[PDB]
């Protein structure tokens, strides 16, 4: 429904560190495929398949209190949209373009207030 360019970022965490492996795809904000599961998919999907990491193509639901919204969990490399889960496979996503990583970090993954506000609202929302 609402599409943007993104990749995956690593599942690999050591101290919540990550290094980008350049991988392309698209993220799509949806309210479900046929809108009856109950929860709001972020469908990721490849133009280049995920590598270096345990992650695969996915259609993944944002469930309150099982999806935390983390603005950036790292400080090695910017551009970290993190959705972290309670031992059900956490998924990290990465901004495909550079709009972050020229400046000191904050809540940046692209932007601070916009993304933070978008992420919290889609997250709570539930069908």
Q: Which of 55, 54, 22, 57 has the alpha carbon at shortest distance from 42? A: 57
Q: Say how far apart CA 104 and CA 4 lie, in whole Å.
A: 24
Q: Which residue has the tokens 């400046």?
A: 103
Report how far residue 58's alpha carbon sits from residue 65's, in angstroms, rounded to the nearest whole number: 20
Three-state DSSP state, 8: strand
Q: Are 8 and 50 in contact (CB under 8 A)?
A: yes
What is the separation, in whole angstroms, between the first and last Cα of the chain? 15
Q: Entry resolution in angstroms?
A: 7.7
Task: Select from 65, 68, 81 the least CA-distant residue to 27.
Answer: 81
**73 vs 79: CA distance, rounded Å:** 10
How many CA atoms lie less than 13 Å away from 17 in the CB half-sphere? Answer: 4
Technique behind the model: cryo-EM
Give CA–CA dist 69/99, Å, rounded: 20
Report helix, strand or coil for 72. Answer: coil
């Amino acid at each position: 429904v609402i599409k943007f360019r993104a990749g995956v970022c690593e599942y690999n965490e050591d101290s919540r560190l990550c290094t980008p492996i350049p991988v392309q795809g698209e993220i799509e904000i949806k309210p479900n495929e046929e809108e009856e599961l109950g929860f709001w998919d972020f469908e990721w999907r490849p133009t280049e398949k995920p590598v270096g990491r345990e992650l695969d193509p996915i259609s993944l639901i944002l469930i309150p209190g099982e999806t935390m919204w983390v603005p950036i969990k790292s400080s090695k490399s910017g551009r970290i949209f993190a959705l972290v889960f309670s031992s059900n496979e956490r998924y990290f996503f990465w901004l495909q373009e550079k709009n972050s990583g020229n400046l000191p970090l904050n809540e940046l993954s692209a932007k601070d207030k916009e993304i933070y506000n978008k992420m919290i609202g889609v997250l709570n929302n539930s069908s």
